[PDB]
Amino acid sequence: ANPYERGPDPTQASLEASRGPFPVSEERVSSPVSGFGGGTIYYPQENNTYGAVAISPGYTATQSSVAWLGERIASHGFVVITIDTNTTLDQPDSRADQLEAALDHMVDGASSTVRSRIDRNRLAVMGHSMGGGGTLRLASRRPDLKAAIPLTPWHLNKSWSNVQVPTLIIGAENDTVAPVALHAEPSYTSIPTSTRKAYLELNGASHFAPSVANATIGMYGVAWLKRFVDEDTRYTRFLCPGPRTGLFSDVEEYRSTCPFLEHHHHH
């Protein structure tokens, strides 16, 4: 059976809840750290190896705008760094470099407590807005990553025809900053159909929906990471065919390259 599985069997209820099943502790990153502005590493207290996730905030924002996400995701069994960027005005491709440097810091710069809890073969990135653009760029050039989740992404580039990393893009229907028509949707469509991918558009939502605790983002974010960072097929049933859409849905639409096919071993 899958040795990367962690935590009890998921339900809709457990994934929509404020916290996952794992108590978490934090490590503040040193002042001058190489390649990014600083951050907070959230890690399960329970001594095991977990996947690791770097999360970038957006233009004019700090780690505080994605702090909820780092704690919520860590509590489902992941090591998560929420970064500050060099400056709050850094553009998406700079945020891509800073996400990569944060991954390097978790495996090669953090305490033994942190390094010992990471399976460094199993890594993911996430980001809000320009951080979401950074997620796409880094994914484009690191096909070794297990997952990428751009949240209401902004990037001047719409063409991601090289991305092989399983990618879940969350768009916000009423986004006026990074309209899904100009960013999320063309970016999604350009990703090769051979890539495991999905696009979840939040009904009614604005650009800033990922900057505060959201049950839909939390549920689908966690389930994506479980499915791909942990290869956890207990989570496939939430992703494929995916959430109910329409008028009383929190989801306006959902696209995917479902089904998501598994590999396996015999004991």
Residues lying near Mg ion in the complex (CB under 5 A): 1, 201, 203, 252-253
Q: Which is nearer to Mg ion, 56 or 216 (CB)?
A: 216
> At residue 49, what are phi and psi to the nearest 5 degrees?
-95, 140
Of 90, 93, 175, 230, which one is the catalytic site residue?
A: 175
Q: Which is nearer to Mg ion, 28 or 267 (CB)?
A: 267
What minimum distance in Å lies between the beta carbon of 99 and Mg ion?
A: 26
211 is catalytic: no
For residue 135, give the 3-state DSSP assignment. Answer: helix
Q: Which is nearer to Mg ion, 231 or 253 (CB)?
A: 253
249 is catalytic: no
Helices (H), 116-259: 130-141, 184-190, 215-229, 236-239
Of 76, 128, 183, 207, which one is the catalytic site residue?
A: 207
Rounded to whole angstroms, the maximal C-alpha distance in the chain is 53
CA distance 221 to 151: 9
What minimum distance in Å lies between the beta carbon of 153 and Mg ion?
A: 14
Q: Which is nearer to Mg ion, 24 or 136 (CB)?
A: 136
Q: Residue 261: CB partners within 8 Å, gap ≥ 6?
A: none
CA distance 73 to 201: 20
Q: Contact, 209 vs 180, CB < 8 A?
A: no
Q: Which is nearer to Mg ion, 3 or 32 (CB)?
A: 3
Look at the alpha carbons of 60, 58, 120, 78 in this order and tell me if their dihedral is positive or negative. Answer: positive
128 is catalytic: no
CB atoms near residue 89 (< 10 Å):
10
Order of strands, sheet of 24-28, starting from the edge strand that comes earlier in the sequence:
24-28, 38-44, 79-84, 50-56, 118-128, 147-151, 167-172, 197-202, 251-256
Q: Residue 62: CB partners within 8 Å, gap ≥ 6?
A: 84, 88
Positions annotated as catalytic residues are: 129, 175, 207
